Design an enzyme around this catalytic site. Structure first.
Site, short mmCIF file in Angstrom:
data_model
loop_
_atom_site.label_atom_id
_atom_site.label_comp_id
_atom_site.label_asym_id
_atom_site.label_seq_id
_atom_site.Cartn_x
_atom_site.Cartn_y
_atom_site.Cartn_z
N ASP A 74 -1.28 5.74 12.78
CA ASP A 74 -1.48 6.26 11.44
C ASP A 74 -0.76 5.44 10.36
O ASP A 74 0.42 5.64 10.09
CB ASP A 74 -1.00 7.69 11.42
CG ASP A 74 -1.38 8.40 10.17
OD1 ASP A 74 -1.94 7.71 9.26
OD2 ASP A 74 -1.20 9.62 10.09
N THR A 75 -1.53 4.56 9.71
CA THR A 75 -0.96 3.77 8.62
C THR A 75 -0.57 4.58 7.40
O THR A 75 0.18 4.07 6.56
CB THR A 75 -1.95 2.66 8.22
OG1 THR A 75 -3.14 3.23 7.70
CG2 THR A 75 -2.26 1.73 9.37
N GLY A 76 -1.09 5.80 7.28
CA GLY A 76 -0.75 6.65 6.16
C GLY A 76 0.52 7.48 6.33
O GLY A 76 0.89 8.23 5.43
#
Ligand SMILES: CC(C)CN(C[C@@H](O)[C@H](Cc1ccccc1)NC(=O)O[C@H]1CO[C@H]2OCC[C@H]21)S(=O)(=O)c1ccc(NC(=O)CCl)cc1
Ligand SMILES: [Cl-]
Ligand SMILES: [Cl-]
Ligand SMILES: [Cl-]
Ligand code: NA
EC number: 3.4.23.16
Lengths: 99, 99
Positions: A25-27
């Site tokens: 999850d880059t967020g």
């Protein structure tokens, strides 16, 4: 590997002697795992996203193996609906977003 | 580009002629933007985030530029903490995760 994004980018992790499925999850700034026991000291933290905040336990210097790649860092444990590998650990395995 | 994850993967988007900042979010199924005016009819959607479920307005077939790349697709509007570009549009710009 190169992971396309047609479906959720789920991988198998090993944490605390347990296998789990988690989302790359880059967020997410940090890594957030569903309730489990981890060794060592912790401190409380509140983290917020869509739908508001949850209370988590912050454990530092925890080793995870992420799709075969070892990393160390902070893991937040609490009532997340999905196990999330956040940027704090994605950097350590050399993950990039490419387009 | 090849975007590392030491900092948040923020980009400029353009939607309705307006520039906004948004987060490239592999952990988001859906693109969710803060309150704004979009054309056409909307449909209801419930999304579940870390803290619980929220209601959003779903607009389909919206023109949106992401880091200079043109996309046309679904945008959800509602009380998100930050503008997030989810996989529905990350696929349109050809994004992959790589390690
Ligand atoms: C909303 C973003 C800014 C932050 N999140 C990470 C996201 O990737 C979550 C990750 C997520 C995924 C599933 C369920 C819940 C969360 N996705 C999410 O909210 O996506 C929504 C839009 O598309 C739909 O598809 C998935 C749910 C929904 S987060 O999960 O809330 C979060 C993670 C870590 C911290 N803190 C620190 O790390 C410090 C704070 C927040
Ligand atoms: Cl860390
Ligand atoms: Cl690097
Ligand atoms: Cl779409
Ligand atoms: Na520790």
């Amino acid at each position: 590997p190169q992971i396309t994004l047609w479906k959720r980018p789920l991988v198998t992790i090993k944490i605390g002697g347990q296998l789990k499925e988690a989302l790359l999850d880059t967020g997410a700034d940090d890594t957030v795992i569903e309730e489990m026991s981890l060794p060592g000291r912790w401190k409380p933290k509140m983290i917020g996203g869509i739908g508001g905040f949850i209370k988590v336990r912050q454990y530092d210097q925890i080793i995870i193996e992420i799709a075969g790649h070892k990393a160390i860092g902070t893991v937040l444990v609490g009532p997340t609906p999905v196990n999330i590998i956040g940027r704090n650990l994605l950097t350590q395995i050399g993950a990039t977003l490419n387009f």
